[PDB]
Design a protein around this motif. Structure first.
Motif, PDB file in Angstrom:
ATOM      1  N   UNK A   1       0.786  -1.282   0.138  1.00 54.84           N
ATOM      2  CA  UNK A   1       0.101  -0.040   0.140  1.00 54.84           C
ATOM      3  C   UNK A   1       0.920   1.365   0.146  1.00 54.84           C
ATOM      4  N   UNK A   2       0.377   2.169   0.697  1.00 54.17           N
ATOM      5  CA  UNK A   2       0.930   3.324   0.644  1.00 54.17           C
ATOM      6  C   UNK A   2       1.915   3.688   1.713  1.00 54.17           C
TER       7      UNK A   2
ATOM      8  N   UNK B   1       2.405   1.659   5.267  1.00 58.02           N
ATOM      9  CA  UNK B   1       3.481   1.014   5.807  1.00 58.02           C
ATOM     10  C   UNK B   1       3.928   1.506   6.964  1.00 58.02           C
TER      11      UNK B   1
ATOM     12  N   UNK C   1       1.667  10.216  -2.059  1.00 61.19           N
ATOM     13  CA  UNK C   1       2.792   9.682  -1.405  1.00 61.19           C
ATOM     14  C   UNK C   1       3.691   8.634  -1.970  1.00 61.19           C
ATOM     15  N   UNK C   2       4.734   8.197  -1.847  1.00 63.96           N
ATOM     16  CA  UNK C   2       5.403   7.207  -2.352  1.00 63.96           C
ATOM     17  C   UNK C   2       4.793   5.925  -1.719  1.00 63.96           C
ATOM     18  N   UNK C   3       4.840   5.073  -2.641  1.00 64.47           N
ATOM     19  CA  UNK C   3       4.263   3.311  -2.263  1.00 64.47           C
ATOM     20  C   UNK C   3       5.662   2.629  -1.961  1.00 64.47           C
ATOM     21  N   UNK C   4       5.840   1.435  -1.930  1.00 65.78           N
ATOM     22  CA  UNK C   4       7.050   0.692  -1.713  1.00 65.78           C
ATOM     23  C   UNK C   4       7.934   1.206  -2.472  1.00 65.78           C
ATOM     24  N   UNK C   5       9.185   1.573  -1.981  1.00 68.90           N
ATOM     25  CA  UNK C   5      10.450   1.867  -2.696  1.00 68.90           C
ATOM     26  C   UNK C   5      11.217   0.559  -2.794  1.00 68.90           C
TER      27      UNK C   5
ATOM     28  N   UNK D   1      13.243   4.590   6.121  1.00 72.55           N
ATOM     29  CA  UNK D   1      13.801   5.081   5.025  1.00 72.55           C
ATOM     30  C   UNK D   1      12.848   5.574   4.079  1.00 72.55           C
ATOM     31  N   UNK D   2      11.632   4.974   3.951  1.00 78.24           N
ATOM     32  CA  UNK D   2      10.496   5.130   3.232  1.00 78.24           C
ATOM     33  C   UNK D   2       9.893   6.659   3.738  1.00 78.24           C
ATOM     34  N   UNK D   3       9.807   6.688   5.130  1.00 80.53           N
ATOM     35  CA  UNK D   3       9.313   8.000   5.740  1.00 80.53           C
ATOM     36  C   UNK D   3      10.146   9.304   5.418  1.00 80.53           C
ATOM     37  N   UNK D   4      11.478   8.905   5.360  1.00 71.77           N
ATOM     38  CA  UNK D   4      12.493  10.135   4.845  1.00 71.77           C
ATOM     39  C   UNK D   4      12.109  10.381   3.448  1.00 71.77           C
TER      40      UNK D   4
ATOM     41  N   UNK E   1       9.376  10.149   1.638  1.00 74.57           N
ATOM     42  CA  UNK E   1       8.203  10.679   1.761  1.00 74.57           C
ATOM     43  C   UNK E   1       8.297  12.165   1.918  1.00 74.57           C
TER      44      UNK E   1
ATOM     45  N   UNK F   1      11.053  14.140   1.964  1.00 77.50           N
ATOM     46  CA  UNK F   1      11.975  14.646   1.047  1.00 77.50           C
ATOM     47  C   UNK F   1      11.225  14.880  -0.175  1.00 77.50           C
TER      48      UNK F   1
ATOM     49  N   UNK G   1      -1.718  12.509   0.596  1.00 79.29           N
ATOM     50  CA  UNK G   1      -2.067  11.475   1.392  1.00 79.29           C
ATOM     51  C   UNK G   1      -2.716  10.221   0.586  1.00 79.29           C
ATOM     52  N   UNK G   2      -3.627  10.538  -0.296  1.00 77.82           N
ATOM     53  CA  UNK G   2      -4.090   9.721  -1.164  1.00 77.82           C
ATOM     54  C   UNK G   2      -3.875  10.241  -2.746  1.00 77.82           C
ATOM     55  N   UNK G   3      -4.121   9.378  -3.636  1.00 78.21           N
ATOM     56  CA  UNK G   3      -4.093   9.928  -4.965  1.00 78.21           C
ATOM     57  C   UNK G   3      -5.016  11.124  -5.450  1.00 78.21           C
TER      58      UNK G   3
END
Lengths: 190, 192, 191, 191, 191, 191, 191, 191, 193, 186
Positions: A129-130, A134, H121-125, H141-144, H146, H148, H169-171
């Motif tokens: 998901x987003x 996560x 916001x990004x999904x899984x990197x 790392x994903x939060x950083x 997000x 950035x 937050x959402x598309x």
């Protein structure tokens, strides 16, 4: 597998596992799932009603499994009045080691060549998901990780900092090392 | 498979499947790979038979290519714990943990049939070795501890030096019933 | 993908855009490090030394990692050839990509401002099946590689081996600024 | 992969970078040794002998191994042709790759400082199915290959056959220094 | 695979390395013998006869076997065309590869010192399904092929048909020396 | 499959038809010989000995073969238990099925008139992967099994070991009459 | 496969080896007969007639068969164009391959000495699904094709239709000598 | 797809249509942003700066998004090179495509009237497996990333970071007019 | 499938059977579907059991089978000929390949077919794969030819025809109505009511 | 599926068999057809005079399997009444029309479909094998149309037209056609 049938003299024909349940022996064999954990809970509840005072013998040969499933067993063990003695056969790993250490203090046993492994939890569920989803699942996994280490430290009479070090990666222990650690109380021989 | 039903004459009649009928005679079968489920059935039968009669021998018939070490260790510790002697017999083959459990029988009561095949070897993967090099180091160390534990217990069963078992379990060591008797895995070879 | 064609003024010569940039001594390592992608880098490094042993070679890295042996073929080629190999991190330099980034000539290791640099101990250099004797051998070889990588990384970063052993235990993600402070890169480019 | 194009000054001639290096008598063995990859090496070795039977040929090896028969086609071509075939280990030379590395001209077998060299007895040269008579035949052929490889390796390394039989029993990983001490390579290149 | 490009001095002509070797009358049979790979050999043999009907053709064989009919197209082309077809075994010549190796001009059949030559009766030339009448037909055709191959092999090797029937019953692996003693090859090349 | 239920007059007892035939000392080996199917035969042979040590046991065989170790568990049980084990071939007794058929008590080995009996050397008793040292071990074990089977077959048939080595080289199909002449069975039943 | 390049002397022109042989009026039918492979043959036959309507065209056949309609496009093109189409069997001419072989100009149908020629009634020209009315239609169309093929084969071979109906009932394999006696080919080439 | 060829008048030069548009300083980002597609954009941006550091570069974007690190290699290249990079949204600019669209030179960010622009916001990197310690690292790392991305987006749009945190937050789908009002683009083209 | 349960009436009591065990009590043995080792051994077990219950009364062998293994069908065939009671055979739906062989194998005069049944005779297909070496393929081809001759010879005996007739007629799939099979010699009578 | 138990304890299908009700549900296979045959044979013995009720809800299936049911229905002494529930298509419609004349029923919203047979088996191999299987399929096609025409009191030419493609009929159309005799309501 074909489960053998045995005859109890009183005649009553049992499968061999129902015959052992009559002796207050509950088996947790293989992975801990919703279905295998609920059978353990059903047996623990049934045995308390048969005799709330007599010990229940919880034989564990499990590589681990679901945390929530193992917690249903764990809370049932602590709730019911009779002491739940735990015995490690073959292996007690992950939630299997948790439930082993969860036995009544003084009644946690292991066989001499059993293997006991403790470690931090893996995925309790996928993290897709987003990034907001996560983050939520990562926070929930960290709360579970702290809860498990805290309960393990309570079982073992150790500091939380000790369990945080030792569960960082897969920590394999012999029966003697688990006894020294505080996971079990005695090692059976004969 | 369809397991045949047999009738036991008593004081009346009782219908058994043929394996429950043989369990009544204190015969426990370990057939095929050693798994958590097949090993726990053996443990359940060993525990049940001790309570029926703690003094009478238990006959453990082994026809197994091997299996899980932890599963085989649950059988092994149950065999050594329970009061009655556990006699072991090799039918067809006793390989890997099957040979370990065969040698684990009560000394003087370990048997094999004349054309049985007994194979001893160091363990393979007790589990995968993925993840990071730190995880792989841990699993490699655990496998080496299991390897030493198995060789040490095998050397005790066979009245041999640990150095002998370390040589002989390096690669798959196949033995006839006579070679296993000379080695120390079994005590006697049955004919009639 | 269709690689664009560009014209070099000299008469005219038509290049694909990567051969045109190789003419400017720019070598790209993009994607995973494999035997084939690493040997192309080695072939380009050897070729550029022959063209001019004195001029700098610019090694642009956008790689998540890859094979250690493949990355070591690049690494030894970078250190062997006479011209300095400057390294630039675009997008990401992870695992052997971060190793090759830190392997650039000291003072000429660069990263772009929003690049991501990740260092970690190696994973499987190969499966660990077979017998316990085979697994022991592959475990020992992986530990030797782990120590060799940490030792070379510590040399690149002017840090103690004990620091790299701590920091490469699990995936260590760094911004360009953190990698500069760590010692993986020397400068961060802006304009 | 896109193989870069380079220009040779002479007029001008455009080469892919591997044909350009073949012009410098550099032959690459990269990846597994197959019938097709080995025959390309043989074709290049034969071609380079015709161009100049006296000048050295540089055989760059980055290979995890492969077919024994394929590697033997390279091996016999290396020994047959008049010019010395120098061998260089980049990244890794394992199994038949280590065999071909040790097969270089004595005194001209090289490895890069962080290369990995692995020697071992052969695995399946082919499946062993069918009847026990067929399995006996394939087992005997594999044992003959095993002895032939150990014998040729012992000759390359100036060691006894008994030493190679011990050391190739299981995967024997060696650094460049250990391979030099063993006798697989003669020198380790640095600059 | 990337086939290297080489330059022939004459002006200049750029060849791939296999077309360059075909200019030297070298034909390669590498890998399994298929309709397509055999027809390329036939096309090259026909072309080389037109270029010079008197000069020898060099047929380099590195093949595990393949189709009998495909190999027979090569075989009949070798015998038909006027120039002698010399055969050389590189790596291996097995099944139809060994047949085509022995099919070279007597006195000009060669093998490299560590090559492996294997002769055996044919396997399925095609499936044997359908009705028992269809299976009988395909079994009879396979037996005719088996006898034809053994008869032609016995002719090539100057041996009795009874010898080839014994020796091709199961996979018969031979060194270059054993194949020379058998009659499959005439000489073993060293330098 | 649905196994029919039959009623035995004694009161009444309901059996499946196979348990009813076991009451008459009839043991079936149908289909491939596996660990599980062989252990059922062993369990039935052990049970029938205890019911009556003196009465014959009738072992009906309709099997294409199977595992050697599984068949050996049946074989040793047949020879160990006191009561004679008569064997009957229905449909086919191939490979270990033919071995167990010939393993019946001499004078009590039967076959039906249109049954098919096939004897042959064993195939793979297990895969032959891993290293050449592992393949050598498994090849040696298969050869020991091959010799043991031929030796026991020669004993059953009152023939020389050399005869069984010839005749088991490839699949040897025999009618009931040919198996009687060979020594695999003693009589052919008609009515 | 890599198709070799050959140089034609005239200035020079570089051909792939198949275009070079087409310049000599050699058309190859290799592998299964498909819409695409048959249309290439038709395109080559049409092109060669335009180049020279009087000179023979050499149609080399190495084919296991294929589509009837595809083979009929070749067949009608062979009969339509003015120049004689000589046919040669290499390796094998089976099914429509044997039909097209026999379809060559009478007196110019050849086979190599070890070629294999197989004639048989057609199989499915397409699936027979759907309703019984659809299956009846496709069965009738297949029977018409079967009769048409046998009738044209009988014309090619100077035999009665009844002979081809017998001989094509099941797969009829023939040596070059048997096909010559049958009437499929006129001569067998040796040198 | 077949990319058309066009002729440039100068003599004449034949281009594929994308190389022809690159000559006009038009770079296309079409489809997902990958290491390979992003490096082609970087190679084109670097090449165009060398051709003329002063003239604008036109970056045409029709992309649903892709890798963040790949998009960051484009992003840092756009900001680094001297010439202004004008961005145009064709069809859609979503995720990193919208980021690179907003990353164009302020005043030169365009969209076509019916284009669709989506920010989120990004999904899984990258996957979040392994142990809870590994999952914690990848979550951090994903939060950083997000933060950035939202920070750079807020800078591009002249908005507060809190606004981008709400809206990504959402598309968040936007027309060209809504993206212009938001601050992602500067102008909407019509004719 | 769910096999129905039926109640057999006896003295003051009821025995519950599945419907196939109930029909076995009436000496009816079913061969339904392909002939396999397991389905053939059930037929053999039932034939042996029924001979013991009453070796004089006829056994009724109902056949609805497309064929199957030759060795499996031969186990049924030899059991039918061995046991003392006559084995009457009835074709329901179809008796093809070994199913037609076992149909013709019934006691002469007691081989029946239903009016719209289909009976098909043909030479055997693969009794097993023919892989391996040409020597192995030759062996399996010879064994298949011996089986082909054995089947045609036994069929010719059942049908009172010459071996040459069965060799012609079994070359390809020979489909026959009940009337054609009666004229051929595969069955003796066609049942109607 | 869990088959309910009703009160000796029967599963609900064995209980209905006690009332001489035989179900043909789903495709007609060797196994499902032989169960119908076994039930028809059993019921004739329980009472040769009482009607047997054959409830059909089937999309079709094997012709040979359906013919085993068909010949058993015609052979046994008791009348076999047929009832269409949901649908009787292909061999299901054939067996529906095969019921005793005057006792063939359908429910008001049932669907009855008649058509020529499809593949009774694949048509691979050689053209000689394909010719044989095509001839056998045509013989089956004629046999089915002939028996259908007999059941419906129609000419063979009518069934040949109407079974050319899938012919769907309501209960009323099947009654007018001659496939069923009555339509049940209450």
């Amino acid at each position: 597998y074909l489960v053998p049938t045995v005859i109890e003299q009183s005649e009553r024909a049992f499968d061999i596992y129902s015959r052992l349940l009559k002796e207050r022996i509950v088996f947790l064999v293989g992975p801990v799932t919703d279905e295998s954990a609920n059978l353990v809970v059903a047996q623990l509840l049934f045995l308390e009603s048969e005799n709330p005072d007599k010990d229940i013998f919880f034989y564990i040969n499990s590589p681990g499994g679901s945390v929530t499933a193992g917690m249903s067993i764990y809370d049932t063990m602590n709730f019911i009045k009779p002491d739940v003695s735990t015995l490690c056969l073959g292996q007690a790993a992950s939630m299997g080691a948790f439930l082993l250490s969860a036995g009544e203090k003084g009644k946690r046993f292991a066989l001499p060549n059993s293997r006991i492994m403790i470690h931090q939890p893996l995925i309790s569920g996928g993290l897709g998901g987003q990034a907001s989803d996560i983050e939520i699942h990562a926070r929930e996994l960290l709360k579970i990780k702290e809860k498990l280490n805290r309960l393990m430290a309570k079982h073992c009479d150790r500091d939380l900092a000790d369990l945080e070090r030792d569960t960082d990666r897969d920590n394999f222990m012999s029966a003697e090392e688990a006894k020294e650690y505080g996971l079990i109380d005695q090692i059976l021989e004969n």
